[PDB]
Amino acid sequence: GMIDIHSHIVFDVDDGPKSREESKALLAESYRQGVRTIVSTSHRRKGMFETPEEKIAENFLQVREIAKEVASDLVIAYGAEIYYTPDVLDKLEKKRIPTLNDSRYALIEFSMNTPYRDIHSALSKILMLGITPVIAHIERYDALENNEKRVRELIDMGCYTQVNSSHVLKPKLFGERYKFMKKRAQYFLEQDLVHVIASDMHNLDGRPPHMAEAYDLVTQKYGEAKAQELFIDNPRKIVMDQLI
Ligand SMILES: [Mn+2]
Ligand SMILES: [Mn+2]
Ligand SMILES: [Mn+2]
């Protein structure tokens, strides 16, 4: 019963599925890997992903209906992946962009080269709104690379961290295109700086879930209890608006 808090499953709204058929197939693979709750977090990013909320909500509702054709016990929750620009503060305050399952948690992302001071300041301002940032794929940010103190300082401030399932995996013997991200993610896991693993799934070619593989790797490397914490228990608390 894994719980996936980072996903692009809504058709025709961002760089995720293009069609209902693609949404269904992505849901089915996710369920095949053992995922039983998925939080939809389609992009909200000024200058790149600006599909109106109303359309995202409309297609999301249709995706939730489609999930019933996959499994009766597949749970589809609403959410957003919020790229940080200053306008998102008023949007969150006014409840015009979604939090995760209507909890206090919002999924926040930055750019690869965003300076630490900007990351810290943005997250600080979101916290002041009464909202808890879950930081999307921490392995993406140059500012955090090999930097336990910075990560811990964001965490101690009141934030939580998320790592993509794809980057939990070992570098492949052939055709590895993302070794550096895998190396970053591995460092974060080793230093125990990861609250949640999520898929960030978009499709069934370049960006599928790797939740089952990642779950077993964490199980083997850190034990079953840590696998349950990162793939089930922490994501569940987020979904149920409980403190971690
Ligand atoms: Mn995307
Ligand atoms: Mn992202
Ligand atoms: Mn994403």
Ligand nearest to the CA of 41: 3
Ligand nearest to the CA of 135: 2
Ligand nearest to the CA of 17: 1
Longest dimension (CA), the chain: 49
Cα separation of 177 and 205, whole Å? 14
Bridge partners of residue 161, in order along the sequence = 135
3-state secondary structure the chain: CEEECCECCCCCCCCCCCCHHHHHHHHHHHHHCCEEEEECCEEEECCCECCCHHHHHHHHHHHHHHHHHHCCCCEEECCEEEECCCCHHHHHHCCCCCCHHHCCEEEEECCCCCCHHHHHHHHHHHHHCCCEEEECCHHHCHHHCCCHHHHHHHHHHCCEEEEEHHHHCCCCCCCCCCHHHHHHHHHHHHCCCCCEEECCECCCCCCCCCHHHHHHHHHHHHCHHHHHHHHHHHHHHHHCCCCC
Cα separation of 64 and 61, whole Å? 5
Cα-to-centroid distance, 225 and ligand 1 (Å): 30
Resolution of the structure, angstroms: 2.2
Q: Which residues are within 8 A (CB) of 223 and not within 5 positions of it... i.e. 6 or more apart?
A: none
Contact present, 219 and 225 (Cβ < 8 Å): no
Cα-to-centroid distance, 183 and ligand 1 (Å): 21
How is domain 1-244 classified at the CATH fold level?
TIM Barrel (3.20.20)
Opening angle at CA 231, ends 225 and 235, nearest 5: 115
Dihedral angle over CA of 198, 203, 205, 210, nearest 10: 20
Cα-to-centroid distance, 136 and ligand 2 (Å): 6
Measured CA to CA in angstroms, residue 94 lies from 89, 91, 138, 146 at distances of: 9, 5, 27, 36
Bridge partners of residue 162, in order along the sequence = 196
Cα-to-centroid distance, 174 and ligand 3 (Å): 26
Bridge partners of residue 212, in order along the sequence = none
Bridging pattern class, strands 196-198 and 160-164: parallel
Cα separation of 9 and 34, whole Å? 16
Ligand nearest to the CA of 199: 3
Cα separation of 10 and 63, whole Å? 6
Ligand nearest to the CA of 16: 1
Measured CA to CA in angstroms, residue 82 lies from 79, 100, 117, 152, 195 at distances of: 9, 11, 18, 22, 19
**Which two tokens mark 172?**
């492949």
Cα separation of 37 and 74, whole Å? 6
Method by which the coordinates were obtained: X-ray
Measured CA to CA in angstroms, residue 124 lies from 9, 85, 223 at distances of: 29, 13, 33
**Which two tokens mark 116?**
């630490």
User: Domain residues of the chain, as ranges?
Assistant: 1-244
Cα-to-centroid distance, 196 and ligand 3 (Å): 14
